[PDB]
């Protein structure tokens, strides 16, 4: 057959690992969609059916964009009385939830609980990365690379070094928003300062939830900064420079990694 | 005949194994069908007999050689030639039984085992589970000779099954899972011998069902979760394509896309 595709009921996690939430669980038309700490209960307002017809539904109503301009908010609304083009979203494999008529993406321009969701111009930013799951906590992996060495954080600095099975400094949290976080300061994010070659990648505050803080583990084993289209690179195949950078893709072993859990 | 990809354990390096597993992958599927960033093996329906299999020739620094046939539609070993004698796993099905006769044409004579090449049967003939059969360039070397001498009558049955369990994971399962390829690569890196951890067992147990869940997935999210294991025994579920993209490299074709 053609692949049936099903209608999974699922949470949607995003910025700083919080959930897509109908505010206060009031399903009146026009009420806002917010970021809220992911619950562990049955409450329908963080549970979303991904319908065959490209609608995302909670309790019966449709996730709906208030409009088609950047910055306008997203509401729960009756699926039949709403504008059909405002109820349709594509969930992408690189983590972005886009509204086709608008070409704008479900966004969380702030990281605090209660933040109102918006649609913004897509810049593959951490504020715009989502994932549908009932798995509330992030994926904690070591990240093995060149010469079988491990990605390691030490305060702001990050480099690869010999893999020690203890070392918490080598544990990483892959967040639903596409950020890669040091296990010991989940407030902080694997970060590129610039969209240019040989940008040295650091650990900084996730505060900005920026394009340079979003990553995707790809099928060829690279790790891609979506906005820049560059990938993680052990600079010059030299661990001892203690510098992981951004570099156009060529696929040699200094750009291949693997999430070993 | 069919494409043949060559590997050797003599001076086998991290390069030599890495380039081997790619070559096998690039010969299993054309890379034409890809679902949510993961390549799909060919569909058996519509695939002609002449492009049904590929062969991998394995040799030692004892210079023994042995040719294994993989079924391109599932990347799994169906049998092996060794000099002038071929041996085949018990085909689960008659149309498989006919595709089988199209391989190793010239062999002095064929043999078909009574048992299939699936882990459950294969472990009980070896008398030990995957959890306890070490893998690495060493074990593969031993396994290559054990397959060669079965023709001679020097390899006892539990050792032949044990040798099969080694080759299937370090060839087929590694070709399916970059994850598993990396676990083998780690062993070649430090020249260690090591039975697979629970994470590796589980992926290979889950391959068929992961192939189904990704291909029937709506937009990446699964209808039902799939349970996996960390390198400790501890458990955790996957609901979505996204973490699998770096972990699975080939899928068995299960349906057509829209």
């Amino acid at each position: 057959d053609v692949c049936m595709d099903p209608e999974p009921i699922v949470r949607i996690v995003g910025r700083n690992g919080l959930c897509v939430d109908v505010r206060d669980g009031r399903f009146h038309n026009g009420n806002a969609i917010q970021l809220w700490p992911c619950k562990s209960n049955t409450d329908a307002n963080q549970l979303w059916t991904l319908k065959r017809d490209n609608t995302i539904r909670s309790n019966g109503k449709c996730l709906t964009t208030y409009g088609y301009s950047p910055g306008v908010y997203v509401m729960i609304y009756d699926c039949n009385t709403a504008a059909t083009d405002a109820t349709r979203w594509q969930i992408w494999d690189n983590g972005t939830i886009i509204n086709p008529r608008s070409s704008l993406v479900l966004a969380a321009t702030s990281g605090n609980s209660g933040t109102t969701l918006t649609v913004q111009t897509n810049i593959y930013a951490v504020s715009q990365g989502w994932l549908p799951t009932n798995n509330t906590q992030p994926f904690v992996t070591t990240i093995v690379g060149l010469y079988g060495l491990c990605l390691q954080a030490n305060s702001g600095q990050v480099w690869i070094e010999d893999c020690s099975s203890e070392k918490a400094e080598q544990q990483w949290a892959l967040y639903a928003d596409g950020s890669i976080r040091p296990q010991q300061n989940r407030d902080n994010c694997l970060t590129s300062d610039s969209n240019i070659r040989e940008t040295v990648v650091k650990i900084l505050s996730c505060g900005p939830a920026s394009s340079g803080q979003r990553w995707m583990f790809k099928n060829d084993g690279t790790i891609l900064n979506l906005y820049s289209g560059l990938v993680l690179d052990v600079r010059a195949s030299d661990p001892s420079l203690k510098q992981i950078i951004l570099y156009p893709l060529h696929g040699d072993p200094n750009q291949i990694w693997l999430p070993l859990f | 005949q069919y494409p043949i990809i060559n590997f050797t354990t003599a001076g086998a390096t991290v390069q030599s194994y890495t380039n081997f597993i790619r070559a096998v992958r690039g010969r299993l599927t054309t890379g034409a069908d890809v679902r949510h960033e993961i390549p799909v093996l060919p569909n058996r329906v519509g695939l002609p007999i002449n492009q049904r299999f590929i062969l991998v020739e394995l040799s030692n620094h004892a210079e023994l050689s042995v040719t294994l046939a993989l079924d391109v539609t599932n990347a799994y070993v169906v049998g092996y030639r060794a000099g002038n004698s071929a041996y085949f796993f018990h085909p689960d099905n008659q149309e498989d039984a006919e595709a089988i006769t199209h391989l190793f044409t010239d062999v002095q004579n064929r043999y078909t085992f009574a048992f299939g090449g699936n882990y459950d049967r294969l472990e009980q003939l070896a008398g030990n589970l995957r959890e306890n059969i070490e893998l690495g360039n060493g074990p593969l070397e031993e396994a290559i000779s054990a397959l060669y001498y079965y023709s001679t009558g020097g390899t006892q049955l539990p050792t032949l099954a044990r040798s099969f369990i080694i080759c299937i994971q370090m060839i087929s399962e590694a070709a399916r899972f970059q994850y598993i390829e990396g676990e083998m690569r780690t062993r070649i890196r430090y020249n260690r011998r090591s039975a697979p951890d629970p994470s590796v067992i589980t992926l290979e147990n889950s391959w068929g069902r992961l192939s189904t869940a990704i291909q029937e997935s709506n937009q990446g999210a699964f209808a039902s979760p799939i349970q996996l294991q960390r390198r400790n025994g501890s458990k955790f579920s996957v609901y979505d394509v996204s973490i699998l993209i770096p972990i699975i490299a080939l899928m068995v074709y299960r349906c057509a896309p829209p």
């Epitope: 060149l146 195949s237 030299d238 040699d252 | 390096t13």
Partner: nanobody, 115 residues
Framework: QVQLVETGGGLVQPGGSLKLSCAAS???????MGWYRQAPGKQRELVAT???????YSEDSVKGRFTISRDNAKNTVYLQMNSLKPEDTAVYYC????????????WGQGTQVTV
């Protein structure tokens, strides 16, 4: 096992130009071959190295001024250098390492560029 012989160390005033050469004795297939440099008292620093497949990593301070070519035929790397600053004054080491084994890394023993 592999050995690297260097050339081109010189004696220059600000604004000159210096080219450095390096020959090698084959190395594993995806590799890099380039130049490092160390002025006494300070630590060793990459200046430029090229990949097996023609891509190069270089240091910000030196880009534009410095050109790095290879030919791979039998293991050559060249470093071309203009707008010479008294800051480009160090011992320059030619380097070659592959990308599969950490061990397989090889150095010359430097040429003193004085500028």
């Amino acid at each position: 096992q592999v050995q690297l012989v260097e050339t081109g160390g010189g004696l220059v005033q600000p604004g000159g130009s210096l080219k450095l050469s390096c020959a090698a004795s084959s190395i594993s297939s995806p590799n890099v071959m380039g130049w490092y440099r160390q002025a006494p008292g300070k630590q060793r620093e990459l200046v430029a190295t090229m990949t097996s497949g023609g891509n190069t990593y270089s240091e910000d301070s030196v880009k534009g001024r410095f050109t790095i070519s290879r030919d791979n035929a039998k293991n050559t790397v060249y470093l071309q250098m203009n707008s010479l600053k008294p800051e480009d004054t160090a011992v320059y080491y030619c380097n070659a390492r592959d990308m599969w084994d950490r061990s397989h890394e090889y150095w010359g023993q430097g040429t003193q560029v004085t500028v």
